[PDB]
Amino acid sequence: PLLAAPLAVGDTIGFFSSSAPATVTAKNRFFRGVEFLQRKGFKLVSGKLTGKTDFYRSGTIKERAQEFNELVYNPDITCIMSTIGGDNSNSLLPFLDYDAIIANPKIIIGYADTTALLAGIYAKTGLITFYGPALIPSFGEHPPLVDITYESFIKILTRKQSGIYTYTLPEKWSDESINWNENKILRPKKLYKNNCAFYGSGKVEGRVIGGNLATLTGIWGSEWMPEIRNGDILFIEDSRASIATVERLFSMLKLNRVFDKVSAIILGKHELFDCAGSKRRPYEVLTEVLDGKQIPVLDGFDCSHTHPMLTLPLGVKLAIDFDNKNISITEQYLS
Amino acid sequence: PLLAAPLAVGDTIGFFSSSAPATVTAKNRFFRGVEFLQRKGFKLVSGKLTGKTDFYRSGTIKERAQEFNELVYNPDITCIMSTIGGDNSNSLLPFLDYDAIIANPKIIIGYADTTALLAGIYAKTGLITFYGPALIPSFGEHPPLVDITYESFIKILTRKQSGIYTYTLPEKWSDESINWNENKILRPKKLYKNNCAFYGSGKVEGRVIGGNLATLTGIWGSEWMPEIRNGDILFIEDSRASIATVERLFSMLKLNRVFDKVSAIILGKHELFDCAGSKRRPYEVLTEVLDGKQIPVLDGFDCSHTHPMLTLPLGVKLAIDFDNKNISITEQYLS
Incomplete structure (x- = not known):
């Protein structure tokens, strides 16, 4: 399998909106998520469709693919994280830069609709991706439940790869x-x-x-x-x-x-x-x-x-x- | 392809509920549809799950397959018509008697969720099935629109098979x-x-x-x-x-x-x-x-x-x- 480098506290996380424009429609929860991860010591890079709306989606099929690809191209980003799901990430699949993903494996994480990308990328590249937290629903959650989510996130992605x-x-x-x-x-x-x-x-x-x-x-x-x-x-x-x-x-x-x-x-x-x-x-x-x-x-x-x-x-x-x-x-x- | 015998005025139509139990939940519309076809001269055979409910469906997966198969086994039936759609007809596919369908080709007609049966039967048998009226939504429709639906139904299924x-x-x-x-x-x-x-x-x-x-x-x-x-x-x-x-x-x-x-x-x-x-x-x-x-x-x-x-x-x-x-x-x- 193709493996990404482990996450470390202080790393840069990039976020993308492959479907619903929740950085706008759920702005309060979005900001809670941003502040949560920043306080943990992470640097955050906002995908180019952050703050944009195209009614039911963040932007065109091509623009959403570009938003994701640009995070792949950024050498500072170790983790690429979905903001939220929706319905429409499957549209991006013909336009994702799979060769770039192979060239620089990164932690790709999200859930729900983002499954289309998680499974699609695995199918094309063999990269081990992650069913896990999306910035808005998962890290915008109030304590105490967000803390348990984070404990798993950080444990899985930072632990030494020794034993089960x-x-x-x-x-x-x-x-x-x-x-x-x-x-x-x-x-x-x-x-x-x-x-x-x-x-x-x-x-x-x-x-x-x-x-x-x-x-x-x-x-x-x-x-x-x-x-x-x-x-x-x-x-x-x-x-x-x-x-x-x-x-x-x-x-x-x-x-x-x-x-x-x-x-x-x-x-x-x-x-x-x-x-x-x-x-x-x-x-x-x-x-x-x-x-x-x-x-x-x-x-x-x-x-x-x-x-x-x-x-x-x-x-x-x-x-x-x-x-x-x-x-x-x-x-x-x-x- | 495998072809069914054409419909004729006075033929027997059997109906089945492969998903939603609308003979119960839309009983008034159901009765209107029944009367509509009866007044056109058709004889109707009620599927065994008529008047039954299992919450969101007419019965178990196997009960629904059995209801459909029993209509196929009936030599008097020229047309097998869906009562209504829903979500769950795809469940029936492993249990349909495809050999009986091949031996006794009939006009199989419905739409929406019933697509699973229409396409599935075609895939398995080569029988030409019909995307068309379901008893409750289509023939329980009030005038004047129901008459136009019927005009197409009767024309397509009874017309001489000559020329386009x-x-x-x-x-x-x-x-x-x-x-x-x-x-x-x-x-x-x-x-x-x-x-x-x-x-x-x-x-x-x-x-x-x-x-x-x-x-x-x-x-x-x-x-x-x-x-x-x-x-x-x-x-x-x-x-x-x-x-x-x-x-x-x-x-x-x-x-x-x-x-x-x-x-x-x-x-x-x-x-x-x-x-x-x-x-x-x-x-x-x-x-x-x-x-x-x-x-x-x-x-x-x-x-x-x-x-x-x-x-x-x-x-x-x-x-x-x-x-x-x-x-x-x-x-x-x-x-």
């Missing part, structure tokens, strides 16, 4: 839709005990692949969708979807023979899932779709739209121990 | 979300002049492939997605989508090299398109995505979620005359 890394489980989490772009808190988010479940036994080790499932539909079947291979661990998360949509997306995977290949499935916690009154969870829907297939599932991994969020390298081996109820990175993911 | 068929252009259309599920209209829908546009010149003739584009993402990459080939005419429609979603889906097609293959694109009228205040239409978004690729486009064909709706065979040759502003079926599509 075993994830810590966030004690509490939330998906409550409050304190988004308001300047003051009013009240802290409702906190839930971590209900992550390990369905299966033994230990499964395999290359992790995936991201936001809804977003994967935008690159599916193309040369930018990384091939899912025998033994892969499929990582998928979705946000604010109906149970109808969740069934549709799970069945899509089934039709594509994905469940004949994967050694395990990781389901990220689903932010504000709409069960249409059925009281069913995504795992139950997956079970129906699987039609007897005995795939072990880690249900409710904290790498999704819920807070706090852990940082996950994509394209390297993980080991899920279903008996000991833990998950580890077992393959080197930074240089 | 050239589509009539509905004089007026609407996409208003009113008058859904009550005995009486609240008020008449706004009736728009037909604003269909033919972008290009000369004549393009090729096999038509596609359907509801959002729905195609549910079967994409699988053995149930018909291969798009050089010279095909791509037919796509979507409903109530944001401009953001439309860009995403158009870019999906681009990434999949679809625009390197097709000789023309048909865009169905987009029901209540949300331009996010940009005042842009889907064609303008398509043009950006195409990135200078010159493909003639029929923008605004009346085969979509808008009323009235024409009936279109999928998988047979059409000829679009961009100079004379018309569209014709040029290949036999029923026995």
